[PDB]
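Dear Dr. L.,

I hope this message finds you well. Following up on our conversation about the binding site, I have prepared a predicted three-dimensional model of the protein together with magnesium ion. For your records, I am including the exact sequence and ligand specification that went into the calculation, followed by the C-alpha cells. Please feel free to forward this to your student if that is useful.
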Amino acid sequence: RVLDATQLYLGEIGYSPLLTAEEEVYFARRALRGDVASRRRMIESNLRLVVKIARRYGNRGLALLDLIEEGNLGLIRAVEKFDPERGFRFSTYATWWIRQTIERAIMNQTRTIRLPIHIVKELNVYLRTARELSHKLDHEPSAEEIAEQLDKPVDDVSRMLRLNERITSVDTPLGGDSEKALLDILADEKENGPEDTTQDDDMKQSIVKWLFELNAKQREVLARRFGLLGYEAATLEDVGREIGLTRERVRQIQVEGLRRLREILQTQGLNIEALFL
Amino acid sequence: EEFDAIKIALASPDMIRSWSFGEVKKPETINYRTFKPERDGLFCARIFGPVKDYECLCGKYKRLKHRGVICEKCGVEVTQTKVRRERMGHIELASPTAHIWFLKSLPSRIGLLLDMPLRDIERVLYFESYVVIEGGMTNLERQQILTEEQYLDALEEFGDEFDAKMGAEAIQALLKSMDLEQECEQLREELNETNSETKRKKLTKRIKLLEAFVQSGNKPEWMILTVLPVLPPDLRPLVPLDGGRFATSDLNDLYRRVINRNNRLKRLLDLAAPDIIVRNEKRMLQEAVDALLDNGRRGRAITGSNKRPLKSLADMIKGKQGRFRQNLLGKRVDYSGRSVITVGPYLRLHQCGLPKKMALELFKPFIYGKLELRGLATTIKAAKKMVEREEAVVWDILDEVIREHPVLLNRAPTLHRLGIQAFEPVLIEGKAIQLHPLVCAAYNADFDGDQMAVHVPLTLEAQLEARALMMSTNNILSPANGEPIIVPSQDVVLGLYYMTRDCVNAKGEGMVLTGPKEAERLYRSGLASLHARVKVRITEYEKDANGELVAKTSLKDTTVGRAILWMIVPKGLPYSIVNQALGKKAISKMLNTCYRILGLKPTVIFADQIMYTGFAYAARSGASVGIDDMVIPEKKHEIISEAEAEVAEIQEQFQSGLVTAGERYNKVIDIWAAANDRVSKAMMDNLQTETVINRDGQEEKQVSFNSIYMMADSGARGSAAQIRQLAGMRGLMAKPDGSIIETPITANFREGLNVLQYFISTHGARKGLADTALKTANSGYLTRRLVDVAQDLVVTEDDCGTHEGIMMTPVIEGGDVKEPLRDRVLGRVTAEDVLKPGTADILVPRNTLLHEQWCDLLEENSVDAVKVRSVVSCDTDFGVCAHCYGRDLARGHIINKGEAIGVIAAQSIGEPGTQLTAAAESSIQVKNKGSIKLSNVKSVVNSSGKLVITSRNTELKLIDEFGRTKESYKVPYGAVLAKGDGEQVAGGETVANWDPHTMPVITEVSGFVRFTDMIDGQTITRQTDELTGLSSLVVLDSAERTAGGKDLRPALKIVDAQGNDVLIPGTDMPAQYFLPGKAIVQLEDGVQISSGDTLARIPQESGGTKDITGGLPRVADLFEARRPKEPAILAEISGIVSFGKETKGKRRLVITPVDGSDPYEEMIPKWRQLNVFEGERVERGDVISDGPEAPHDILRLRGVHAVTRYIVNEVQDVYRLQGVKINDKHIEVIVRQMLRKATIVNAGSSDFLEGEQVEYSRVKIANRELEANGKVGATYSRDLLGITKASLATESFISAASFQETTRVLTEAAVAGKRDELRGLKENVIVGRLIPAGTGYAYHQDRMRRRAAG
Amino acid sequence: KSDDVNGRTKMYKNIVDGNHQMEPGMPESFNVLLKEIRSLGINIELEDE
Amino acid sequence: RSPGVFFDSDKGKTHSSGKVLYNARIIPYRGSWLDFEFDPKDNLFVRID
Amino acid sequence: ARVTVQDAVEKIGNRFDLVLVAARRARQMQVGGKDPLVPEENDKTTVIALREIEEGLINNQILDVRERQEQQEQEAAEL
DNA sequence: CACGTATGCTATAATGTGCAGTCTGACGCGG
DNA sequence: TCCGCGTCAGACTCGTAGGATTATAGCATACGTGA
Ligand SMILES: Nc1nc2c(ncn2[C@@H]2O[C@H](COP(=O)(O)OP(=O)(O)OP(=O)(O)O)[C@@H](O)[C@H]2O)c(=O)[nH]1
Ligand SMILES: [Mg+2]
Ligand SMILES: [Zn+2]
Ligand SMILES: [Zn+2]
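The resulting structure of the complex is given below.
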C-alpha cells in the first residue's frame, strides 16, 4: 500500500478530466453565477497545472506539498476572478495567480524572522543586480559596487545585506559527531552565576547595615524614595505623600543621607575599591 | 515545592488548555527591526510573559513599583522573566490528529484497544478508505473498512441508517463511542469458550488494557489530539549570537510547519474548498504534528537547511542525548578541575599534590570568607581583586583553608567505586597533579599522558563523607574479592626483590650482626652486599592467645638486605614473612597479614614505608636494560630446522592426496605449538639458572641475576611469554578473524624481524587494538544493564530471621584446587548448625560471621559442604539483611545496614570484563595414588580390551586413603580408559587417553554397518582417490542440503550376519547411531565391526584465542536468561519412568509417578538420543538428553538454589578462565533481582486472580495477612526474568524510562495512569534529592516515619 | 554544584560565611523534562504530599 | 568500492538453514544499482536500488 | 582521626551514622560556636568532631540529651 | 500624510512527483 | 506456526575548530497608528 501523502494526492488529481475552451466557458459562466459544481470541476480539472508549476519553485523554503497547497489557493482566486466572455484561455490566467501566490508565500514563511515583503523585494533586486555585477566583474561584488550600480546610498545596501544573515540551529552538532552543539556552549547571559547573584546579596545587605547607622529622619525619606524599606519606589516630588510634604527639604535630606553614607563606605574600605564593579 | 509521588496520564484536550496561557495563531517569532516578540507569535510576550524582569514590552510599567499590573497598551503582565521558561501555550487544530506515540509505538494501543489492525487504521487516517462507526443495519457491521467504491454502493441502498466516516474524525468517534465496560465483560465471556494459548494471551492483554483504562480514568478520545500544547519559549530559545546572527531550536521550525498548515486548513474551511484539497491539508497537518512529536518515527524524518533530521520533542527525551541519560543521571559540576597527573613518590597514602593556581581557583569562596574574617578584605569585590593580584597574604590564607580539607580525585573511566578516592591535598608550584603510586592500581593510572579530575566536597557532610568513606587510607580492599587493591607495583617490587634476594658469599659471607641497624650500617658503609648470607639476630613479635604480643630473640640465617627491610616491618608480624626473597605475590600477602593482625593505621603507614624503601633500593640497584640481557637458546636453529622438516613431511603427505587439508592444518599447528613451548622452555632454563659460575668450594648453581629475568620473576614487569619474543622465537600470530595463520614467527625482537615476519605480526596486533576500541562498548553496556537491575537493592535489616541458605562445596577443577571451600564461604553467615564430619558434637554457632579463625578450623576438621546464608534466600522485603550478605569485602568486617549493595555488585561484575577487553588435552595423568571413581558413566569393553566410555558428561575423581575428593577431571565421549571403575592407580599414570581434534561416534553392539537415509547428493557426498580407491563419505547438514532430503535423518544402522537389526543390551532399541552435519565417515556400507569401533569422526573446529571477546557474550546470555538453541530434557516430578508409544520414531514418554498417579506424556525428536535408559527412579530435574540447560526450566523444576547455583557456576567458569576473582555473592545479588517477579496461577483474597505477574515481596506480604485472616490463599509460581526485562518490570516508571525504550515506557505508564512514589536511588538522583541509601538512609527513614505518621 | 539555581547562590553565601550548610532544592533540568513531556501531550503532574 | 560488478554471499543469512545465498551487484559510478540474488528455494531474483 | 578513621568508626559502628553525628557536631562548632572538648591543636571542626567521637565524648544519644536539656531550660525561662 | 504591512492584478497556451545506499544478533508480531 | 519486516539497544570523561546557503516580478491601491 502507498502511504506517501504526495503519491496519494497526485493519484486523486489524475482522476479528473482535462477541459477544452468551450467546456471552460460553459462551466465558468455558471461558476461566476454561483454554481457549486462548476467551480469545483474547474478547480479539480486544473489541479494538475498547479502541481506542474509547483515543481519549478522547489529548494527555496517549504517542501513540494506546502507549495502545492499555496498554488491551489492561487488557482482558487483565479477561478473566482476568471472572465469567460474574454477570448483569453483559463490556463494562461491561472498560471499568473499560482506563480504569484507561491512566490508571496515563500517570502513570509521561508525565513524564521518574518521580513516584510517590501524589505524582501528590495533585497531581491539588490541580489539580482549583484549577480549581473559578478558576471562581468569576475570577483563577487562589494557593498559600494552594488550601491554604485543602483545609484543609491551605501548605507541602504549595508542595512539591506545586514538583514540577510541566516539563523543557525541551536541543536546542530559541532565537529560533525552528534555530541555537544551550540546549546552545550551557548551560555545564558540573562542568568548570572552564584558569584554575581551573591555579590548583589552582599551589596544590598551592606547598604542596609549603614542605612541604620545614619539619622532617624535621614533613612525615613531616602529608603521610602528608592523603595528599599517602603512599598513603592517614589520620586523626589512623590515623597511628600508620606509625611515630609516638601520638595526642596526632601531633596536636601535625600543627599544628606547619601553624603554621610559615602564616608561610611570610605572608612570601611570601599569607595574607589567598590567603584570598578 | 517538595512532593511525595509523580503521576503520568493521557492529556485531555481540556487539560492541555489548563496549562496554556494563550493560543499561538502566528508563525511570527520576533520583529526583524525591534527584536521584540510578535503578536500571538511563538515568542509572544503577551502569552508567555515579559522578556525583561518586571518590564512590559512597550515599557509603560517598570520595576516592582508595578507588581501584578497587566499593561492595557501592549497586553503584557509585569512579572519575572523566569516565567518565559514556565508558561505554556496551545494551538486549536481545525481537524483532529492521531498522537503518534499511541499509534506507532508498539503495542499500537489505539489499534490494540479498537481490535483494529494498524494498516487498517492508517488507510482510514490517510483517507484511502472509509470505516463504519455504527451501521444500525446489522447488514453492515462495526469497524469494517469500505473502499471509495464500496461506500458508493451502500450509500444509495442503505445510506442514512449507516454512519461510516474517514480520517482522524472517524477513529476518534469510534474510540469515543466504544464502551470499555460492556466490551470488557463480552470478551471475558468469549475467553471461556475454547481458550487457545495465543488467543488467551491477546484476550488477557485487551482485558488488562480495558481494566487499566477505567482505573486510569483515561478516555479513549484523548488518544486523538484536538488541542496541541506549545513548549515555553526559553525551552526552545531564539537567541542572538555576538555577530548579529541568530540561532534557534529545531522545534521552532517544526512549530512553524504545524501552524502554517493548520491556519491554511482554517482558511480552506472558511472558503468551502472541494474535499480532495481539504484532505491533502488534513494529511499535511497530521504529517507536521507527527514530525513535531517524534520526527524519524513514521517515515522520512523532516530535515532542515543542515540536511539533517530536525530534532523532535521525543528526541530530547530519547536516547543518550535525551534529558534522562545526559542531563539528569549525570551532570557538569562546579568546583571541578582537571590536569595531567604525575608521580608523587614522596606522598603518603592519604595525600595528593595539588597545583597552587588550581587550588586557588577551586576554593575561591572559602578564601573570600576567610579574608573577611581576618578583615584583610573590606568586601567581596575587594577580596576578588586581592585574589586576582595573587597577593603574598592570600597564599598564606589558601594554605590555611586547604588544611584538613579532603579533595576527590577521579580518573576516566570510573569502573568501580575506587575510581574516585579522597586525599588531603598538598599545594605544589607547577601545573600537574601528583598522584600516590600505590593507588595507581585502583585508578589503572599510568602517567603516559593520563589526566585526572579534582572535585571539592563543599558541605561539612560531604567533607566527612570524603574523609570517612572515600579516603584512600580507608578503602584498601577490593569490594569484588576480599583482596587488598593497594599493592606495590613496578619499581617498588623490583627494589624489595633486589634487597631480599640472595647471592653466593659476595661481600661478608657468614658475618654475625647484633641488630638490623648494624646490618644497615654495614651495607651503606660498603663492607657487606645486600645479598650476603649472614647469621644476624632479630627479635620478632608473635601475637599470643590475647591481645598481648610475645617477643622472641633468635639467630636466623638471612641476608643483610632482609635485616634492613625488617626495620620497615611493624612489631607484631613474624620475621619468616620477610625472610624469603620477596616478589609482588609475597608483598600482597604481607599487606593482607598486616591488615588482619594489626589493622588499618599500621597497614597504611607500612604500605607507605614499603613504597619509599622499594623505590629507594630500586634506584640504588642501578638496574637497566642491555642487549646482552636478552639471552636466546643455543639450540634455536636446530629446533626450527627440525620443526621445518616435520611440517614438510605433512605437506608431502597432503600432495599424496591422503591427509585432508584440515587435518594437515591441525597437525602443522600442533607441531609449531610444541616447537614454541620447547624453545621457550629452553630459553627459560638457559636464563633462569644460567648463573652456574660460583666460588667458595668449586662450581655451584644459583638463580641468574639477569636484569630482564629478575624483572619477570619478581612480577615487577615482563612475563614468560614476553621473553619469548625478546630472545627466543616470536611464535604463531592469530589474524583479525581470530584464526591463526599457517606461517608463524621464528625470529624475536633482539634478532630482528624481516618484512614478512613484521607484516604477519601486524594482523594480530591491529585486531587486538581494534578490539579494545570497539568491544569496550559491549562490555560497558553489560556493566550498565547490571547496575540498572541491581540499583534499588540496599541493606535494609540486620537479621531477616530466616533459616534459609545454599549448601556450597569446594571447586576441585583439575589438579590444583581452583576455589577452596574456605575462600568460597569466607565471611558468609552460616545457616542451621554446621559442625565437623563426625555428627556427635556442634563446632560452629548458628548466627556467626565466618572469621579467618573459624575458616582455619573448618580445614582441620575437613568440612565437606556447609549451608551458608545467601542474598537470594533472604526474607527481607525491599532489600536484604546484613546476615544473608555477610562481610563487606572492602571493609574486612560485617556489612553496615544502609550500604547500597546492588550497585557495588554490578560494578564488581562489570569492571573486570570492561578492563580486560594450548588446548591439547590429549590425556589425563593422575598425580597422587588413589582408587579410580567414575560417576554419571556408562562404558562398554571393546575388541582391543579397553574400557571405552559411551557417555557425554563423564567425571573422574581421585579418592584418597580415608575417602574424600582430591583431584577431578572431565573425561569426554569416546575416551579410552587405562583402568575401569574401582581399580587402584599409581602416581604419574595415564588413566585416560583420546584424540582432541575429533568427536567420535562409538557403537555399543557388534555386527555389520547398514546405510539408512544416506542417498548420494541429497544427504551425503562421495570422493575417491587412485589405483585401489579409498572413498570417504561426508554428511551434509541443512546448510549444504537440498529440500529433497530435509526430513531424512542420516544414520549408520547396526545389523547381524543374516541382515537383521541388533538389539542394544537391556532395551527394546534396534542399534541406530544418527550422524550429525559435516560428519566424516571412513567405513562404507557392508563392513564388519566389533563393539567400541568408531563409526564416524565429527570435526571439532574451535581454534580461537578465547581471551575476553568470546566469554562475555556467554555471560551476557546467562544474565539475559536466554534459553539455548538445543535444550536438554529434564524430569518434571519424582517417580517411576515408563516408556510408551512412538509416532514414526518420535519418542512419547508415558511417565507414571507414585503419589501423583495421573500420567504425564512428552514428545521428543527422533534423532535426539537419551543418555538415561528408562524404567528408573527419577528425581525432579534428572538430565535425560545431552545439551545446555535453560535457567527457566531449572527454576521451574528444581527451584531457586538450583538455578542460582547454575548461573553462579557457569558465569564463574568464564571469569575463572581469565584469572578474575569475583565472589559468588555479587552474582547472587543480580540473580535475586532476576527472580523479582512471580506469576499468580489461582485467585487469592485480593484482586490478583489468574495470570497477573506481581513482585514476590508484595504477594508474600499479602500471604502474611491471608495467614492471619485465612480467606482464599494465593497460589503462585516464581518466574525468572532477564536483566533488561527485570529492570523494566520495576513498578517505578521513572527508573524504567531512564534505562531504555523510553517512548514505549511512557506510553505504557501514561495509559495505565501510573503513579511513582519514588523509593529507588535512580529516581531520587533524577529529581536531585537525597539517596535512600548509605549516608541518606538515616534521613530517608526519618522521612519514612514522618510519612507513616501523616 | 549544577542546576539548583537557588541552592548554588545560597551555598556560595554559606561558604563565604564559613558555615558549610547544604541548602538544596530541585535541579532546573527536571522542571524542563516535565514541560517537554507535556509539550508531547502526556499529562505528567506532581501529586504533593 | 570500485564501480563494476561484484559477487558476494552472506555465509548463513538464515542461521536456521545456514544456506549460502550468492548475489551479484552491478555498481555504476552514476545511476541505479542492479542486484541479482538467490533465495533459499534457489530462485533467482532481481532488485533495483 | 585525621589519617585513619577506623577507631572512630569502632566507637559508633555505622560509618554512615559516624558521618551524620560528626557533621551535626561540626555544625554546632561551625555555627553555634559551641566549645571543643579536645584541644583543637589548630585542626578544623570536622577533625575535632571525629577526635571527640574516637575518645567517646560525642554520641547521637548524648547530643540528643544536651539538646532537650538546653531547650527545656529555655522553655522554663520563657514561662 | 507617512510608514509599515497587505492585498491585487497582469489574460498566446501551458494540466501526474522523481532522491536510496544496505551494520548485527535478538526479540516480537501479522500473515 | 514459520518466514519476515520492524525495533531495540551498542562504555565513561577529554579535546581542536566555526558554519555556510538559496531567493522569492514590478507597481498601484489598501489598512492601522503616531506626529
Ligand atoms: N577507557 C579507555 N581506556 C584506554 C583506551 N586506550 C587505552 N586505555 C587505557 O590505557 C592503558 C594502556 O595499556 P596499559 O595500561 O599499559 O596496560 P597494562 O594493564 O599496564 O598491562 P601491561 O602493558 O602488560 O603492563 C590501559 O590501562 C587502558 O585501560 C581507550 O580507548 N579507552
Ligand atoms: Mg595511561
Ligand atoms: Zn506595556
Ligand atoms: Zn536475610
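In brief: Residues 57, 59-61, 99-100, 102-107, 110, 120-121, 123-125, 127-128, 166, 168, 172, 174-175 of chain A lie near DNA strand G (CB under 10 Å from a C1').

With kind regards,
A. P.
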